[PDB]
Design a protein around this nucleic acid. Structure first.
Lengths: 135, 215, 71, 144, 102, 67, 148
RNA sequence: CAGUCCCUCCCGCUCGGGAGGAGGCACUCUGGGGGGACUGCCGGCGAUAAGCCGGAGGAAGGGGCGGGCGACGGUAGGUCAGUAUGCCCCGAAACCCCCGGGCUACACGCGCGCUACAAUGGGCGGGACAAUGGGACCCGACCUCGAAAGGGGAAGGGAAUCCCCUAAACCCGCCCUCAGUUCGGAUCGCGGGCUGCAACUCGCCCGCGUGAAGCUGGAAUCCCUAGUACCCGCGUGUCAUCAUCGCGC
């Protein structure tokens, strides 16, 4: 084998992704990629697997550990990481251009992630105001 | 349960868009919404991904995400938990874009089985028709008030089409024993033929008709 | 449709805005697939439009359209 | 490879649930579906299914995890009691599908309580949760 | 030798590695093998108060925050080295806790 | 807001291209060697803006009017 | 089918629908959603089955189970009333029994001269907390019981 | 078991998947320092100025972004019922001690919230997922009895090292068969738990029965501009107890 080590982060899911020579093992958090019940976020991982790694996938072992509470946050944290990991293995930069087939999240992140809540006029939430009928 | 999940995973890989449909079969022949209907997707056209770049970055959003958003809209302040529950997914989707995604997918299976065409071929044809093509804006310069003929933006046509179509579908579904999947599918069929039976064509006419009267 | 109700026309230039409403922006259109095969008209459009877009024109006969001024 | 790591859990739980009907030292006791149900529900089941999926599901977790109490199996996706117009809070589930199950996997030995104070797998519990995936490794590794 | 964990919690930004790289100076009076300062988290305390006593109308309430920033240093050395460190700990500014294991 | 700058940035940059006019550049990486030493510091972000104006000022002597 | 009728009477001459077994037993007072199924297991009848198509034999089973719960089982926070009138060990409730039992204890409390009791008498909540400005718009308080 | 000579465990179609300790600091991460963005550069418009648009490199850009920061003063705004304080009054008292009560009384009206009206569904079951924080008469591992509220025994932890702790939305299959109800939780009976001298008046929680009003809202009116709103749960505070509250994630 060999070790190439990359990170992705989307939405405070942090992906610790190792790509090693293999035989087509997909492990995410210890577990199969074929356990995943939500349809939507599964399909998310599936984009680099026929748009960055047509034949590479069967041939290589990708293990990730994806540490967030999201599931489109984990799905897209993991996607960055796998996406980048596949393109390095083949040594092509012609798969860097298969991240231009959709809105960037396979190599570029967001400078803004949250706003802390404000006390407002006394009501929850960061931006908000209460109804106004004081009479 | 598990074998079905494996297969539901297989079909998009092989390659298929969304589930088992092809984006390939269309009949977009309208030059207006030619550059605002997006045919790049080959796996998913709702991820999360997004635009806030520019105003026509908004009409470059892949058609089905915009559709998901329009389907999602109504649902007030409630409380979704295991319980015994209710009611919650409203009657028009209290929950996430995640839940919204499922209906559109189901609706796509019912409508393909019926029409014997892809739901893309039906929906795309339906948006070209369902969209009104004239509006009046109140434009005064100098004091004198004219209510002259004004042309809709291409982006404004796409939004209005999507909005009418969802909105109307829901309207009979409410307090009723339909599957929504059916309701949605049936609204898309009549909107596409240009029948005044759909709520979509009603509004398409009424907006242009009022514009013709002011004009 | 595939030729519409409309008369399709493409925007040669976006001249400026009219109203004191702001609401309409005035944009110069030339038709080549619709009513005429060379006419230039200055129509009143609403909302976002930028050079090179395609605009479907419904007015080709009344030719009431306001000319002045950008404020 | 035949381990539960490799194989979607959904099938492993489903397999076990129908072989606990064959073991057959585990069954529904009368008391449990009667009113001694995990919280209150819309409709209380009379089925064999309810119980057998609940035992089958417990046997599976202790293998993948370390010690697993009876304090973290009260809810797992829901396990709430309706508090009126005040919003729902979690509450501690029926003992007649958690604790009672783990003491009949101690007459089967499949799980055991350690002198370490916890719950742990035995190899007879991993010769009954790894004989369920020797039969199939082709409809669950067709897209690994 | 005896292993000491010196755990050093500080309210100041620049008193935290200035007493975690210059407490190596205090410490050493005999030979020592020392671990470079390992950053532990900021543990964050918030306390939010109303600045308004009346509360009325619209109001803006002060959310305060004190961030206490932690470094952990290990040292393996004699009794005398450990002592230097617990003999003086200044005004605080710097809380010094010591854990003793062989 | 908008990209407008108050004259405090403008004040310090103007003084420095008074001393040595031709010993400043249109390159931003030399005007943070000489510049850095001379100019009033309280941040790195403030340092860049005065530095930006000393850079900009050199380009303006080229085009035939310098503030 | 599994009978010639579409309405069977069980738990007495109280009606059983054409919809669901579970729903119809809840509808008969003193026979709740949970209680329906406690009898259903003992008599033996499926949980998912249509109302309105039972054997004659089954009708007999529901009445005897209700009459003396104690023979059959029935835990001592599952039975309708345990410790009845502070001196009776156990009884049960059915439709006719539920009216009388609650009405009595309510009547008692009035006699005792309870605060709780007099408030009921007026038509007011006690442990319902507020009566402040809720039931707004001239409306009904709500309170017990069925009429739909 | 990143990566591994070593070491303990399980299964195998004995290919191969996972974890602990030696060991390793790579990675993920943590806080301290540094760099990076400034219309800096280039073209256009423009007085060659101020400034506006476009392009390139790039992770980001043209106040990058979100907060903090708010003058002289005024509405005779609010707090002498938090403290300070002018003045005036009170001295078995407008003081001082104590038990009991009320602030939630209710035909209603108005302010601010919440729950909610079912098949876009619920139940049942299974599987994938947190983050901020707080924690020694305190969090409470795990083990037993109870459907439960709770009790009994007991480990560790004054904290990246242990505990609360698995989030919830999500999704698949079945069951249900679309009523004012298996919706919805009002009110109330009986049984019980907990705190305190005590929870009728004014507590919460559970089990069994009860199951109301409500079936999509008139005039009229309110909120918000991006990681925001729509929407989902979680934590914390005050703290014996009342949360559909407040602060925060």
């Amino acid at each position: 084998m060999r070790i190439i080590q990359t990170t992705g982060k989307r939405k405070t899911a942090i992906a610790r992704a190792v790509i090693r020579e293999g035989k087509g093992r997909v492990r995410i958090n210890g577990k199969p990629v074929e356990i995943i019940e939500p349809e939507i976020a599964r399909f998310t991982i599936l984009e680099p697997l026929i748009l960055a790694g047509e034949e590479i996938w069967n041939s290589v072992d990708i293990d990730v550990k994806v540490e967030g509470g999201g599931f489109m946050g984990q799905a897209e944290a993991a996607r960055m990481a796998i996406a980048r990991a596949l393109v390095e293995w083949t040594g092509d930069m012609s798969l860097k251009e298969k991240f231009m087939k959709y809105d960037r999240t396979m190599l570029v992140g967001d400078p803004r992630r949250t706003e802390p809540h404000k006390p407002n006029r006394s009501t929850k939430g960061p931006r908000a105001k209460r109804q106004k009928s004081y009479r | 349960m598990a074998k079905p999940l494996n297969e539901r995973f297989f079909i998009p890989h092989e390659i298929k868009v969304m589930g088992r449909w092809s984006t390939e079969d269309v009949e977009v022949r309208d030059p207006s919404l030619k550059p605002y209907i997006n045919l790049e997707p080959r796996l998913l056209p709702h991820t999360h991904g997004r635009h806030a770049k520019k105003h026509f970055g908004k009409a470059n959003v892949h058609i089905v995400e915009r559709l998901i958003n329009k389907i999602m809209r109504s649902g007030g302040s409630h409380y979704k938990v295991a319980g015994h529950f209710m009611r919650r997914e409203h009657r028009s989707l209290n929950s996430k874009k995640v839940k919204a995604y499922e209906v559109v997918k189901e609706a796509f299976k019912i409508i393909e089985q019926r029409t014997g065409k892809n739901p893309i071929q039906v929906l795309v044809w339906a948006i070209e028709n369902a969209a009104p093509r004239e509006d009046t804006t109140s434009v005064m310069f100098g004091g004198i008030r004219y209510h002259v003929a004004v042309d809709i933006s291409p982006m404004r046509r796409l939004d209005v089409a999507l909005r009418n179509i969802a909105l109307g579908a829901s309207a009979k579904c409410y307090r009723n024993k339909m599957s929504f999947a059916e309701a949605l599918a049936e609204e898309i069929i009549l909107a596409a033929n240009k029948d005044p039976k759909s709520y979509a064509y009603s509004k398409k006419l009424e907006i242009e008709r009022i514009a013709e009267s002011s004009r | 449709m595939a030729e519409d109700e409309g008369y399709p026309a493409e925007v040669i230039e976006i001249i400026g805005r009219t109203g004191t409403t702001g609401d309409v922006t005035q944009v110069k259109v030339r038709i080549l697939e619709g009513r005429d095969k060379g006419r230039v008209i200055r129509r009143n459009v609403r909302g976002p439009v930028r050079i090179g877009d395609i605009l479907i024109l419904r007015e080709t006969e009344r030719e009431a359209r306001e000319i002045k001024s950008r404020r | 490879m035949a381990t539960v790591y490799d194989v979607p859990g959904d099938l492993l739980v489903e397999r076990v649930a129908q072989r606990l009907k064959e073991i057959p030292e585990i069954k529904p006791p009368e008391w449990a579906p009667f009113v001694k149900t995990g919280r209150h529900k819309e409709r209380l089941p009379e089925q064999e299914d309810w119980w057998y999926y609940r035992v089958a599901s417990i046997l599976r977790r202790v293998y993948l995890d370390g010690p697993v109490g009876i304090e973290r199996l009260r809810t797992y996706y829901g396990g709430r009691k309706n508090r009126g117009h005040a919003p729902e809070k979690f509450y501690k589930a029926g003992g007649s599908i958690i604790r009672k199950a783990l003491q009949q996997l101690e007459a089967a030995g499949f799980v055991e309580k350690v002198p370490g104070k916890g719950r742990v797998i035995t190899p007879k519990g991993r010769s009954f949760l790894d004989k369920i995936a020797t039969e199939l490794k082709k409809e669950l590794e067709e897209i690994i | 030798m005896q292993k000491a964990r010196i755990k050093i919690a500080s309210t100041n930004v620049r008193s935290l590695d200035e007493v975690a790289n210059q407490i190596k100076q205090i410490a050493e009076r005999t030979g020592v093998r020392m671990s470079g300062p390992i950053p532990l988290p900021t543990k964050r305390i918030r306390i939010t108060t109303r600045k308004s006593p009346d509360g009325e109308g619209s109001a803006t309430f002060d959310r305060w925050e004190l961030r206490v920033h932690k470094r952990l240093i290990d040292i393996e050395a004699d009794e005398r080295a450990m002592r230097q460190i617990m003999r003086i700990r200044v005004p605080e500014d710097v809380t010094i806790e010591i854990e003793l294991i062989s | 807001m908008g990209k407008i700058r108050q004259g405090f940035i403008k004040r310090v940059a103007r003084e420095l291209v008074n001393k040595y006019p031709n010993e400043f550049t249109t390159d931003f990486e030399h005007n943070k060697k000489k510049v850095q030493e001379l100019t009033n510091v309280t941040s790195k972000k403030i340092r860049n803006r005065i530095a930006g104006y000393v850079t900009k000022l050199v380009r303006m002597k080229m085009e035939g009017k310098i503030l | 089918m599994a009978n010639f009728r579409h309405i069977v009477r069980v738990a007495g001459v109280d009606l059983d629908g054409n919809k669901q077994l579970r729903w119809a037993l809840t509808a008969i007072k003193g026979i709740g959603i949970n209680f329906a199924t406690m009898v259903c297991r003992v008599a033996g009848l499926d949980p998912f089955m249509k109302a309105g198509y039972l054997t004659d034999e089954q009708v007999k089973k529901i009445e005897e189970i209700l009459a003396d719960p104690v023979a059959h089982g029935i835990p001592r926070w599952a039975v309708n009333r345990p410790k009845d009138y502070e001196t009776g060990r156990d009884l049960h409730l059915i439709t006719a029994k539920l009216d009388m039992a609650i009405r009595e204890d309510i009547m008692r409390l009035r006699r005792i001269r309870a605060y709780r009791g007099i408030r009921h008498e007026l038509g007011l909540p006690v442990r319902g907390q507020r009566t402040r400005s809720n039931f707004r718009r001239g409306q009904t308080v709500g309170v017990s019981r069925k009429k739909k």
